[PDB]
Symmetry: C2
Subunit: 49 residues, 2 copies
Amino acid sequence: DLELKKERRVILDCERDKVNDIVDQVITIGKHVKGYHYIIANLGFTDGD
Amino acid sequence: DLELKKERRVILDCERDKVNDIVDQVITIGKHVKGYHYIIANLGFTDGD
Ligand SMILES: *[C@@H]1O[C@H](CO)[C@@H](O[C@@H]2O[C@H](CO)[C@@H](O)[C@H](O)[C@H]2NC(C)=O)[C@H](O)[C@H]1NC(C)=O
């Protein structure tokens, strides 16, 4: 549904558990290619894999 | 190094073990995006994940 508007910039605002699920979903879909930018809005950045 | 020749079609000819590692490496480097075509040269295609 986000692909209809051609939106490349995504901002993630969740805890240390949902961010891993979103990352795994992006990996399975294939959105981590050069041309995107994610923002993990949380106090911890290196906590997740 | 393969990206230098601008080659997108890759033919995989390995057992049921190396193909999984190659698929995992492709997933990690983000080459499974639309625009590539892989060929698994083996009798068992549904065997691997
Ligand atoms: C399947 O992957 C191949 C690899 O690019 C593509 O199929 C090509 O399909 C187009 C569309 O019919 C043809 O014009 C080409 O001749 C095909 N062969 C190539 C490009 O080598 C396509 O990206 C994918 N989908 C289909 C339906 O083939």
